[PDB]
């Protein structure tokens, strides 16, 4: 007969490794500019987690762009929280930044994160 | 402070990378295995394989878009491991486990090699 082995922590090991590559600046293929700050990253991971990035890099005219400039209303700390979440599965929230996180998540079109922020606010 | 860990996040990200690969989106390297070409993402290859990690960290090979593997390597075996990289599922037959193991050995996928090693005993 046939056989199969499912490695249950494989995806998590891949994601850790993608983050290690990011932290060392290896194979990063885009810089996200958020006002005065810059975040180096992998297009594939951004696409995987965000509707906005997915749309941006699915566009033929913008596929091979290496710098993406976000709306200047977006705060860098909020984008960093969400970038860290994309690469770690961990969403860090304080009461002092959840509106900023939520607002950023709405702009990036990360609806599951938006909804988690919604539910946190109801449990204040 | 508060923290939320999303336990299926990595699995969702991996599924989405595989969906991108199936549609040939942002694939950036062709792996040649005898007469067969496999399109993939360098980042996923590096994350799963010691050899690809070494190839794509090499200054002389970082910006190459085609990699030719050793011509002894099986295409079916490489395909089984490529599927595993993007899905976490290693499909094995008794007819191809040695090819898979051999290919895993060549790609420096030691945890996969050792998993096959345990089965051959059982």
């Amino acid at each position: 007969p046939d056989s199969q082995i499912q490695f249950t922590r494989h995806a998590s090991d891949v994601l850790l490794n993608l983050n290690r590559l990011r932290s060392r600046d290896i194979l990063t293929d885009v810089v996200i500019v958020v006002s005065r700050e810059q975040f180096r990253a992998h297009k594939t991971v951004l696409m995987a987690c965000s509707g906005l990035f997915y749309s941006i890099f699915t566009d033929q005219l913008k596929r091979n762009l290496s710098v993406i400039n976000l709306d200047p209303e977006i705060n860098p700390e909020g984008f960093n929280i969400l970038l860290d979440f994309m690469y770690t599965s961990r969403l860090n929230l304080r009461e002092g930044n959840i509106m900023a996180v939520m607002a950023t998540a709405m702009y990036l079109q990360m609806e599951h994160v938006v909804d988690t922020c919604r539910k946190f606010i109801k449990a204040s | 402070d508060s923290q939320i860990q999303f336990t299926r996040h990595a699995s969702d990200v991996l599924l989405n990378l595989n969906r991108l690969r199936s549609r040939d989106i942002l694939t950036d390297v062709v792996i040649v295995v005898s007469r067969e070409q496999f399109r993939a993402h360098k980042t996923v290859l590096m994350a799963c394989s010691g050899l690809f990690y070494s190839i794509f960290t090499d200054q002389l090979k970082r910006n190459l878009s085609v990699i030719n593997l050793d011509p002894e390597i099986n295409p079916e075996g490489f395909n089984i491991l490529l599927d595993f990289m993007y899905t976490s599922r290693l499909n094995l037959r008794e007819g191809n486990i040695m090819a898979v193991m051999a290919t895993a050995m060549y790609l420096q996928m030691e945890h996969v090699v050792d998993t096959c090693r345990k089965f051959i005993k059982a």
């Binding site: 965000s50 509707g51 997915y54 599965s89 | 999303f6 299926r8």
Partner: peptide, 17 residues
């Protein structure tokens, strides 16, 4: 009064086939 939550719900959009 902080907390740590492990949550198994979907976290991100699904890219279609």
């Amino acid at each position: 009064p902080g907390g740590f939550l492990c949550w198994d719900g979907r976290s991100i959009h699904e890219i279609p086939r």
